[PDB]
Amino acid sequence: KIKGTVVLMPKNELELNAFLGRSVSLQLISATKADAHGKGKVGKDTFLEGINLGAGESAFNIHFEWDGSMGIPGAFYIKNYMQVEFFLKSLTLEAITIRFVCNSWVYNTKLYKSVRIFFANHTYVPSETPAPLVSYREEELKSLRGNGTGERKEYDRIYDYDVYNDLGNPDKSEKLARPVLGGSSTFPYPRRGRTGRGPTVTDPNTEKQGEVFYVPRDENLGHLKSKDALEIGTKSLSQIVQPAFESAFDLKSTPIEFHSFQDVHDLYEGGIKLPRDVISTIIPLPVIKELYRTDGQHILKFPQPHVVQVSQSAWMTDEEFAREMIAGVNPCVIRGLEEFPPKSNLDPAIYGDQSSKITADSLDLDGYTMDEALGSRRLFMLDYHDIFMPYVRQINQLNSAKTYATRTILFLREDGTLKPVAIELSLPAAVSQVVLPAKEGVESTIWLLAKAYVIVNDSCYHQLMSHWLNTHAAMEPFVIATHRHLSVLHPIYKLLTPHYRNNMNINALARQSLINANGIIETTFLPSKYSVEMSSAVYKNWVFTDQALPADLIKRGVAIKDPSTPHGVRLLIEDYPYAADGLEIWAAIKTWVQEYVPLYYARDDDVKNDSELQHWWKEAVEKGHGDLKDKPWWPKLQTLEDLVEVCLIIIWIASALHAAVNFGQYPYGGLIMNRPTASRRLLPEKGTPEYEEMINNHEKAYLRTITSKLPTLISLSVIEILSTHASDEVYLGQRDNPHWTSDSKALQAFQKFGNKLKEIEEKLVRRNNDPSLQGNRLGPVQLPYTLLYPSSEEGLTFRGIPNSISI
Ligand SMILES: [Fe+3]
Name the nearest CA neighbour of 423 among 353, 350, 325. Answer: 325
Q: Is 472 annotated as a binding-site member?
A: yes
Q: Is 732 helix (H, G, I), strand (E, B) or coil?
A: coil
Question: What is the separation of C-alpha 194 from the centre of its chain, rounded to a whole number of angstroms?
Answer: 19
Choices 3.40.50.720, 3.30.1440.10, 3.40.50.1240, 3.10.450.60: CATH for 332-458: 3.10.450.60
- H/E segment holding residue 648: helix 640-652
806 CA to middle of ligand 1, Å? Answer: 7
Catalytic hit among 662, 674, 776, 803: 662
Q: What is the DSSP string of 247-297?
A: HHHHTTSS-SS--SHHHHHTTTTT-EE--HHHHHHHTTSTTGGGG-EE-SS
d(CA 418, CA 326): 9
CATH superfamily of the domain spanning 243-331:
Lipoxygenase-1; Domain 3 (4.10.372.10)
For the domain spanning 3-142, the CATH number is 2.60.60.20
The angstrom resolution of this structure is 2.6
659 CA to middle of ligand 1, Å? Answer: 8
Name the nearest CA neighbour of 456 among 514, 515, 525. Answer: 525
Where are the CATH 1.20.245.10 domain residues in the chain? 459-803
Residue 321 CB partners (closer than 8 Å, separation 6+): 315, 420, 451, 454, 455
Active site residue 472: yes
Strand (E) positions, 503-573? 559-561, 569-571
CB 607 within 8 A of CB 640: yes
521 CA to middle of ligand 1, Å? Answer: 13
The CATH class for the domain spanning 143-242 reads few secondary structures
**φ/ψ (deg, to 5) at 64:** -105, 135
**Method by which the coordinates were obtained:** X-ray
Return the half-sphere exposure (C-beta side, CA atoms, 13 A cut-off) of residue 274.
Answer: 31
CB 479 within 8 A of CB 503: yes
542 CA to middle of ligand 1, Å? Answer: 18
Per-residue b or e along 126-157, where b marks 16 or more CB atoms closer than 10 Å to that residue's CB: beebbebbbebbeebbeebebeeeeebeeebb
Q: Does domain 459-803 have CATH number 1.10.10.10?
A: no
651 CA to middle of ligand 1, Å? Answer: 15
Name the nearest CA neighbour of 330 among 468, 171, 199, 488. Answer: 468
**Rg of the chain over all Cα atoms, to the nearest angstrom:** 28
CB 787 within 8 A of CB 780: no
Active site residue 658: yes
102 CA to middle of ligand 1, Å? Answer: 27
Q: Is 807 annotated as a binding-site member?
A: yes
Active site residue 306: no
Residue 541 CB partners (closer than 8 Å, separation 6+): none
- H/E segment holding residue 762: helix 744-768
Active site residue 467: yes
Give the type of residue at 257.
E
d(CA 663, CA 179): 30
d(CA 110, CA 266): 57
C-alpha distances (whole Å) from 53 to each of 9, 19, 59, 147, 262 are 11, 18, 8, 39, 51
Q: Is 617 helix (H, G, I), strand (E, B) or coil?
A: helix
Where are the CATH 4.10.375.10 domain residues in the chain? 143-242
Catalytic hit among 658, 714, 725, 803: 658
Q: Is 662 annotated as a binding-site member?
A: yes
Neighbours of 15 (CB within 10 A): 11
Where are the CATH 4.10.372.10 domain residues in the chain? 243-331
- H/E segment holding residue 105: strand 98-106
Catalytic hit among 385, 462, 472, 485: 472
Catalytic hit among 467, 490, 499, 567: 467
Name the nearest CA neighbour of 712 among 720, 722, 724, 701. Answer: 720
CB 388 within 8 A of CB 372: no
Give the type of residue at 187.
F
Residue 661 CB partners (closer than 8 Å, separation 6+): 329, 330, 331, 332, 462, 466, 467, 470, 471
Active site residue 662: yes
665 CA to middle of ligand 1, Å? Answer: 10
C-alpha distances (whole Å) from 418 to each of 105, 365, 454, 493 are 52, 11, 16, 43
Give the type of residue at 507.
N
Q: Is 462 annotated as a binding-site member?
A: no
d(CA 288, CA 294): 12
CA 138-143-146 angle, 5° bins:
130
